Amino acid sequence: MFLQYYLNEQGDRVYTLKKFDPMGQQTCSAHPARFSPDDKYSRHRITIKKRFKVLMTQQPRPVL
Template sequence: MRFLLRKCSKCYHYTLKEKCPKCSEETVSVHPAKFSPDDKYMRYRLAERYS
């Protein structure tokens, strides 16, 4: 039952559904990924964010 809250990236409406009830766009999770000090993929995420 964790991590249910989702957000539409188009109209910024918060919902629990996979598709936004206002604009029918796909929603994304609003919760950040878990932090791990030995994260093997941090380099790739940072490169994607700043490119």
């Protein structure tokens, strides 16, 4: 849809309409991916998120 964003230097979302940020990188869509409850590709997403070290379990653990 219309809302895009890019991250500033302290990790906050900076919302914008424009497809490119002030440093020339592409802006992400603000909205998450569309979900289906009948999705059967859980194995597949874990498989390659593990491979490229971007699964949520492999990130730095949050400070609570």
